[PDB]
């Protein structure tokens, strides 16, 4: 019976992919922290749409879904 917010609290500092709603782009990286709005911070992220990205901030409105 897990809800979304404890699900993000359980996914902290685990490898998580996040699919944005636009190009079917997903950022694969270790989650750092989340906001009330579910803003995302990531370390060692990689952009799949192939690249490697050091640190990332993702705004809440553009994400489609979050997976592990």
């Amino acid at each position: 019976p897990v809800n979304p917010k404890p699900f993000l609290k359980g996914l902290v500092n685990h490898r998580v992919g996040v699919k944005l709603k636009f190009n079917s782009t997903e950022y694969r990286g270790t989650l750092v922290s989340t906001d009330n709005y579910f803003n995302l911070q990531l370390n060692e992220a990689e952009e799949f749409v192939h690249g490697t990205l050091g640190e990332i901030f993702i705004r809440c409105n553009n994400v489609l879904y979050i997976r592990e």
């Binding site: 803003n39 911070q41 990205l53 990332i56 901030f57 705004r59």
Partner: protein
């Protein structure tokens, strides 16, 4: 805990925490350390900008930021670069913001 229960100062401590410890701490640490950031808007045009200021809504003040936008018609591509000395950016357009090494 919902926001309507808290008092006037508890919201100030909450925003201080969210900026100091939270996702937007990526931007805050970028403002103090003078590290240039990369910002992708919804438009699809990416700015390399140094952040003077930022805010809750993510709208932020950047100086010396450089804008990079490409366009294609029938798979004919051209890359265009535009330099503006001062920028105020409304935060609803942005999607991903990364902190350069």
């Amino acid at each position: 805990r919902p926001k309507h229960e808290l008092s006037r100062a508890e919201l100030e401590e909450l925003e201080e925490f969210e900026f100091k410890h939270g996702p937007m701490s990526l931007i805050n640490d970028a403002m103090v350390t003078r590290t240039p950031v990369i910002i992708s808007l919804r438009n699809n045009h990416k700015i390399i900008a140094r952040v003077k200021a930022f805010d809750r809504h993510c709208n932020m003040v950047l100086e010396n930021v450089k804008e990079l936008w490409t366009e294609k018609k029938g798979k004919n591509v051209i890359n265009r670069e535009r330099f503006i000395s001062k920028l105020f950016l409304r935060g609803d357009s942005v999607i991903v913001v990364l902190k350069t090494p």
